[PDB]
Ligand binder design. Structure first.
Ligand SMILES: *[C@@H]1O[C@H](CO)[C@@H](O[C@@H]2O[C@H](CO)[C@@H](O[C@@H]3O[C@H](CO[C@H]4O[C@H](CO[C@H]5O[C@H](CO)[C@@H](O)[C@H](O)[C@@H]5O[C@H]5O[C@H](CO)[C@@H](O)[C@H](O)[C@@H]5O)[C@@H](O)[C@H](O[C@H]5O[C@H](CO)[C@@H](O)[C@H](O)[C@@H]5O)[C@@H]4O)[C@@H](O)[C@H](O[C@H]4O[C@H](CO)[C@@H](O)[C@H](O)[C@@H]4O[C@H]4O[C@H](CO)[C@@H](O)[C@H](O)[C@@H]4O[C@H]4O[C@H](CO)[C@@H](O)[C@H](O)[C@@H]4O)[C@@H]3O)[C@H](O)[C@H]2NC(C)=O)[C@H](O)[C@H]1NC(C)=O
Ligand SMILES: *[C@H]1O[C@H](CO)[C@@H](O[C@@H]2O[C@H](CO)[C@@H](O[C@@H]3O[C@H](CO)[C@@H](O)[C@H](O)[C@@H]3O)[C@H](O)[C@H]2NC(C)=O)[C@H](O)[C@H]1NC(C)=O
Ligand SMILES: *[C@@H]1O[C@H](CO)[C@@H](O[C@@H]2O[C@H](CO)[C@@H](O)[C@H](O)[C@H]2NC(C)=O)[C@H](O)[C@H]1NC(C)=O
Ligand SMILES: *[C@@H]1O[C@H](CO)[C@@H](O)[C@H](O)[C@H]1NC(C)=O
Ligand SMILES: *[C@@H]1O[C@H](CO)[C@@H](O)[C@H](O)[C@H]1NC(C)=O
Ligand SMILES: *[C@@H]1O[C@H](CO)[C@@H](O)[C@H](O)[C@H]1NC(C)=O
Lengths: 254, 298, 217, 105, 116, 202, 298
């Protein structure tokens, strides 16, 4: 009826489907559009020189082999059929450890469309490494990014672009950090060149201005207070020596 | 030939079954009935603004493709039949690093009822985010959330529901409390529709209301601070003919106040605002400094 | 070629679930080690790290071929297709093999059926340190291993004459200790499932008081 | 036992204007409050579920607005057939209804 | 889609009644079934709750011990048994079906129970 | 010979074996007996409110499908056959992170006996969680237990007991904790009730 | 339909292919050309005697079984084709615990040239061991090695070689430096043979030369030691009639030296010899103690 029809459609789509080959393998490059919904930026560590972020990372491309016309609706399939389709080998150049969430199942999304378009989303928590310039700590502003690149396919096999180019990354203004504050963010398209070829790259950068109230009450207030305390040594008369020594040395040791 | 009839039932059950298609893909809406049995409310980490919870997560729905007829009315099957049928792809919207336990086998439960109703239960430890506002630290009350829903199935495909009355769905065990610093007062469930870049999804929200216990911060910081203030006020009864005495009084009470403030600010995260322990320490420091300047004046 | 024919003929009618001589005699396994480094011996968790090249060799009469080549030298691809003993370290808290860039395992089959199987391991073994006389103490704490499921009547272990070989001993992570020697031992232990042949390697360490001196004394 | 206080008990108004009914709970009922309409000598019909979710088959002039405790039902540009009794009922716990609200012309 | 209840009747004070509610268009093993009581020109009052798949029931504390709700999946019906009647039991009894975010979307036709 | 007989016996045992069904799927429950050989108790953490223990965890039950009579010896099989047999879905209720050791292979044991008795052993490193009452710290005594339950199978499908009932847990008197000392240990058998049914628990 | 032809090509390449055999097992020696692109030289953990390094690790060899003739001259295939064919089993001789990234897909690269050449690239994070001689700490220089070779393949079977000129084979990126405490000066490659218990193996060595930056240790230890010594020496200018003043000067200066030595010793790992910072702290402590004993004599 309406279920076995879709069953036959999906079985026909996946019959004679080579996962080793990208769409238009010997033809023009395939365009892949990116979306990121940032869920949280967890911990920006200065000692590890990294920052953790959770995101809903979605990719959209067009595969002419996954094109159907028997049924008129869009197909959201179980997330385990993404192991039987071709998905791009996207990676993050500056990460240290990353994973797709696997609760309650592998947090990934596959979605087909009748014209051939495939949408493929993941929920990724990644610890990306960004080297900070702490010459003005804690009155500093550090811009560190996430680079999104293709590993195997060069720029003549695949194309990366932000899907929307200004609304591709959402949820940045709703992010609340305990120590920083996102002032601005930028999206960049690029092509990098290695010894194996030229590869497309996207880059998502966040400028974080560090807050000061924590540092005020933790270090600037105690140091100013100890320096104020070390001035009552003059109000004491110069005859009593032991008192002034104890006071001044206690401020120096503090 | 005692298990051959059940093997035939299970083989016929999966013969012609596509585990990539939800029940009623273009015909109906999948109704999932959810239930949570909290076996232990884990420790609440204050520096990461997160908490841990360990739950039996139960989901029930109806698949007309899994109807059978045999000598049993409910098949209590293994945790490997669940990977050969369609199960909903529930994720936790505010989870950080959750684990679905598989010791010694995958802690999953599958029960199929003869009319096609499935009960699917998992045992998993969720580490979720709890954004806290620490104005009243350490006399603050929080509502730590736990939001879940379906990944990739919008409201027109999969909708969630509590299987019992919403006030009796999320059930916390009695011995299940691994809280050292907080106090679990009650639970609070909720339902809504969030909208993201792929459509509108149903989200089931749970709130656990926590109230911090002050009995540790009292003895840690509030009692040394009041003792230091009283010991600073001791100096007002001494005779002015002993100047080094009151001098070492002032400088050492300011020194202990500095150490206590540094030693007290390592408890809570590196928040940018002032708390109520910070206000208490600041006023106590002001009192100590006022005693020292009063000594300087006299 | 012909090596493909040999490898495909060895695996026909082969059952990797059964040890050689499953109802005839126990299998004799000769074990060798090569210690790359003995890691930090931290006394907090009562453990120490070690990195070894663990090599086992035994006889499997099913992997016997007739050809003009004497030895087949293979990858880790065929390790999971033949019978491999279930050796495990009894005093390890954590232990992992190495998988970068390809699983660090080696299999070599000979003309008469002798199989040699080597793999690289990094073990975080435990040894209870009686911390009296600290830091002027000397220890000798072990690395033990045996089969998990096969008792003495099914798998028998035996050292070779050149059993345990250390490397340079200078590139090792022994900060507070100093390696002085080792000794091998074999024994049989009573377990709820049966008698198991257990092999132990005791590394003898002496704590060098060069850190505790300028640290505390 | 969560009690629902509905207001007002009765309200008389003409055709075409905007009208609003209020319902309050003693305890917490998080967007699980439904609004039913019962005509004389008939059975109650579900109008609004959740707190703001129009039932499949109702006009667009009914609107629900919800919270944790305070809920409201707004009917803009009423007709001659929207006169009936209106009950608010919670479902966060075992269901309890409100006293009702008569609507007269 | 439709819930059909029994017919109105009179009953003598002190007897017992059994009201019926026949469901058509769905299977009662999927949803919960509620029984609601309405007095003339008053608000609705919830009597009790039955889970037809398992069989466990809950009742309003005011109606605890007075009403007994049961089900029959063969004839696809749900029953409400009232015992030890009084004069304040003259009401209209409704049989409702749970669905769409705990809303009681489908109701019966209501039976008039009068006590003389 | 002996290799051919054992080979065809094991191949006959695994031919037509339904891993979805427990032994006596419609009949009486299957009885599983537990042994624990405690190798160590690693770190009893008061800040994390947990402890870590390594154990040799063994389960014994009787499956009539794995019955043979042509050879008089017990069959220890390579541990990879444990993925082709039914083993109970035992779990620990109060654990936080567990794993089976994997050097040099997955540390587990599967043994078949001629009467159908299957012996299944694992080597586990469990970080179990126990809340401590530190009101008398450091002059305190704390009892925290490892709970052993069956997840999927209810008490009318499976049954747990200790193999020996007093000697099922060994190696506990040999534990050398640096900060504590084991005073006593107990083995308990009961049944717990959850909203899905009744489950056996050790 | 230009996808069926490449499927037929890839299926003809793998028809009768045995990935348990190296290319040229009976005729020649497998020669693998190696390349390393360091995308970031990670932090050097001196406390663990190890360092981290993120690399593109490239290998290239010739397999006469993967010759083809199609419209394309190079097949830039997936990372799941490299598991069905033979690839060298390179391992790091001094690697401790390395990872191979799997995000989002396995970060591997396989290219097959028309004449049979294979290019195989991986992206992985090596955590290798760097034995350090901390006799001149913190004014020391190191040469952290990275030895890799073939596991299971002797010198008569698989040999390694650099794909370009040895001075130009290991390439470190410009912004590829996650070092906070050291300064990368250059690279240094070598190749040799190790004699093991199973045969001779080709080993390719790479040394990264590091020089420790003194800017941290100056402000941490050398500025407090000099300032504390000056604080001890300023006591000699006070008159001899105020003995408690100079006494508490000396003893609190000793206190400062002790807490300084404790805070400065906890940075460096627990080596069993004396470094340069240890000698500096010892001589400064000797000067401070000599000042206090000299005052006691006075
Ligand atoms: C609870 O659930 C847990 C999670 O699901 C689960 O943990 C999992 O355990 C299982 C089983 O123990 C693991 O699966 C095995 O993993 C072995 C290696 O384990 C190490 O590496 C993995 C990551 O594995 C990748 O890399 C290895 C080596 O390169 C591959 O072999 C894997 O396939 C996999 O490859 C991909 O991913 C790479 C990036 O990671 C990519 O670069 C690559 O391109 C691939 O895409 C780590 O995760 C492990 O860490 C964890 O586990 C260790 C255990 O020691 C812990 O100590 C540690 O703390 C971590 O927790 C670990 O480091 C694999 O070797 C193994 O693959 C073979 O065996 C299986 C099972 O028999 C076969 O089905 C499979 O076919 C493989 O066999 C082939 O190859 C072997 C080689 O030895 C041959 O012997 C064999 O004959 C066969 O040969 C044939 O096929 C070849 C191609 O495959 C071909 O080339 C040959 O020619 C021939 O035809 C297996 O995958 C799994 O990784 C764990 N998962 C995680 C995340 O931990 C846990 O067990 C569950 N617990 C319980 C109680 O239920
Ligand atoms: C944080 O730092 C990063 C990296 O330094 C910044 O990214 C860079 O932004 C600039 C300005 O938008 C880019 O310059 C552009 O060059 C192109 C050349 O065609 C020109 O057409 C554009 O108009 C613009 O001038 C630059 O390419 C880009 N990437 C770099 C510099 O690596 C980022 O903007 C910084 N701040 C924030 C808020 O992210
Ligand atoms: C490892 O074990 C072997 C075998 O037991 C030891 O070799 C023996 O050494 C003794 C002398 O101490 C000889 O009398 C035996 O005949 C040797 N046996 C054989 C056949 O090797 C070897 O010394 C041990 N190495 C240690 C203890 O590290
Ligand atoms: C499929 O998705 C597209 C884009 O999201 C949308 O425009 C279209 O209406 C969808 N198809 C159906 C049948 O709703
Ligand atoms: C098999 O095991 C049982 C129980 O351990 C034992 O009694 C019996 O003797 C064993 N048989 C053989 C052949 O070892
Ligand atoms: C790496 O990813 C591939 C495909 O996503 C998967 O098949 C493989 O199991 C993964 N490896 C690990 C260790 O997770």
């Amino acid at each position: 009826s309406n279920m076995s029809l879709v069953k036959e459609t999906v079985d026909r789509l996946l019959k004679g489907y080579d996962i080793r080959l990208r769409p238009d393998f010997g033809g023009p490059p395939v365009a892949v559009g990116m979306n990121i919904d940032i869920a949280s930026i967890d911990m920006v560590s200065e000692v590890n020189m990294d920052y953790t972020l959770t995101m809903y990372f979605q990719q959209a491309w067009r595969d002419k082999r996954l094109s159907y016309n028997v049924i008129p609706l869009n197909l959201t399939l179980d997330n385990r059929v993404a192991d039987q389709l071709w998905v791009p080998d996207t990676y993050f150049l500056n990460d240290k450890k990353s994973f797709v969430h696997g609760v309650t199942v592998k947090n990934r999304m596959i979605r087909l469309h009748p014209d051939g378009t495939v949408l493929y989303g993941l929920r990724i928590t990644t610890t990306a490494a960004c080297m900070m310039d702490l010459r003005r700590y804690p009155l500093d502003e550090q811009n560190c990014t996430l680079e999104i690149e293709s590993y195997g396919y060069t720029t003549d096999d695949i194309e990366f672009y932000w899907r929307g180019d200004d609304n591709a990354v959402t949820g940045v203004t709703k992010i609340e950090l305990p120590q920083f504050s996102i002032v601005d963010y930028k999206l960049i398209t690029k092509k990098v060149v290695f010894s194996t070829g030229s590869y497309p790259r996207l880059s998502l950068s966040f400028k974080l201005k560090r807050n000061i109230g924590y540092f005020i009450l933790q270090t600037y207030m105690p140091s100013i207070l100890i320096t104020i305390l070390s001035w009552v040594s003059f109000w004491i008369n110069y005859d009593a020596s032991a008192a002034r020594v104890a006071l001044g040395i206690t401020t120096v040791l503090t | 030939d005692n298990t051959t009839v059940f093997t035939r039932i299970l083989d016929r059950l999966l013969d012609g079954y596509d585990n990539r298609l939800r029940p009623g893909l273009g015909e109906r809406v999948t109704e999932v009935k959810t239930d949570i049995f909290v076996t232990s409310f884990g420790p609440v980490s204050d520096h990461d603004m997160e908490y841990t919870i360990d739950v039996f997560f139960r989901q029930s729905w109806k698949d007309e493709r899994l109807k059978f007829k045999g000598p049993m009315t409910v098949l209590r099957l293994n945790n490997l039949m669940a990977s050969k049928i369609w199960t909903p792809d529930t994720f936790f919207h505010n989870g950080k690093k959750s684990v679905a336990h598989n010791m010694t086998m995958p802690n999953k439960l599958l029960r199929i009822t003869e009319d096609g109703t499935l009960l699917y239960t998992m045992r998993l430890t969720v580490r979720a985010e709890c954004p806290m506002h620490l104005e009243d630290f350490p006399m603050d009350a929080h509502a730590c959330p736990l939001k879940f829903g379906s990944y990739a199935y919008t409201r027109a495909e999969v909708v969630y529901e509590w299987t019992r009355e919403p006030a009796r769905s999320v059930v916390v065990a009695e011995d299940g409390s691994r809280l050292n610093q907080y106090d679990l007062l009650g639970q609070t469930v909720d339902s809504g529709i969030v909208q993201s870049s792929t459509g509108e999804y149903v989200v089931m929200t749970t709130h656990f209301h926590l109230k911090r216990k002050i009995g540790y911060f009292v003895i840690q910081t509030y009692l040394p601070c009041i003792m230091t203030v009283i010991l600073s006020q001791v100096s007002f009864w001494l005779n002015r003919e002993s100047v080094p005495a009151r001098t070492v009084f002032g400088v050492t009470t300011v020194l202990t106040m500095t150490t206590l403030s540094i030693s007290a600010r390592n408890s809570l995260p590196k928040v940018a605002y002032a708390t109520a322990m910070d206000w208490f320490i600041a006023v106590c420091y002001a009192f100590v400094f006022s005693a020292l300047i009063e000594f300087a004046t006299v | 070629g012909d090596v493909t024919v040999i490898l495909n003929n060895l695996l026909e009618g082969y059952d990797n679930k059964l040890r050689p001589d499953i109802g005839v005699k126990p299998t004799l396994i000769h074990t060798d080690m090569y210690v790359n480094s003995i890691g930090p011996v931290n006394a907090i968790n009562m453990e120490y790290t070690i990195d070894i090249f663990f090599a086992q060799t035994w006889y499997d009469r099913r992997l016997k071929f007739n050809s003009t080549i004497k030895v087949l030298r293979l990858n880790s691809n065929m390790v999971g297709k033949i019978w491999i003993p279930d050796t495990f370290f009894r005093n390890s808290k954590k232990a992992d093999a190495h998988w970068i860039t390809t699983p660090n395992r080696m299999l070599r089959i000979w003309n008469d059926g002798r199989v040699l199987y080597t793999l690289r391991l990094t073990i975080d073994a435990e040894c209870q340190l009686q911390l009296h006389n600290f830091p002027m103490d000397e220890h000798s704490c072990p690395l033990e291993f045996s089969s998990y499921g096969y008792p003495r009547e099914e798998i028998v272990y035996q050292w070779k004459r050149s059993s345990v070989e250390v490397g340079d001993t200078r590139s090792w992570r022994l900060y507070q200790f100093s390696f002085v020697g080792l000794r091998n031992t074999t024994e049989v232990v009573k377990t709820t499932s049966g008698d198991y042949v257990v092999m132990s390697v005791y590394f003898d360490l002496s704590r060098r008081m060069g850190y505790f001196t300028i640290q505390t004394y | 036992n969560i009690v629902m206080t509905q207001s007002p008990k009765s309200m008389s108004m003409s055709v075409g204007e905007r009208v609003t009914l209020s319902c309050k709970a003693s305890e917490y009922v998080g967007t699980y409050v439904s609004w039913y309409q019962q005509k004389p000598e008939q059975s109650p019909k579900l109008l609004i579920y959740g707190a703001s979710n129009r039932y499949t088959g109702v006009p667009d002039r009914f609107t629900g607005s919800g919270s944790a405790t305070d809920f409201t039902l707004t009917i803009g540009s009423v007709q001659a057939e929207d006169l009936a009794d209106y009950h608010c009922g919670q479902s966060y716990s075992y269901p309890t209804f409100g006293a009702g609200t008569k609507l007269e012309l | 889609v439709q819930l059909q209840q029994s017919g109105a009747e009179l009953v003598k004070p002190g007897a017992s009644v059994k009201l019926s509610c026949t469901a058509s268009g769905f299977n009662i093993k999927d949803t919960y079934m509620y029984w609601v009581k309405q007095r003339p020109e008053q608000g609705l009052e919830w009597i009790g709750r039955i889970d037809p798949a398992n069989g466990d029931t809950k009742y309003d504390p005011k109606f605890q011990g007075k009403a007994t709700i049961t089900t029959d999946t063969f004839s696809n019906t749900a029953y409400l048994q009232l015992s030890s009647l009084t004069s304040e039991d003259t009401a209209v009894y409704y049989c409702a079906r749970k669905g769409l975010r705990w809303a009681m979307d489908y109701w019966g036709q209501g039976t008039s129970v009068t006590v003389s």
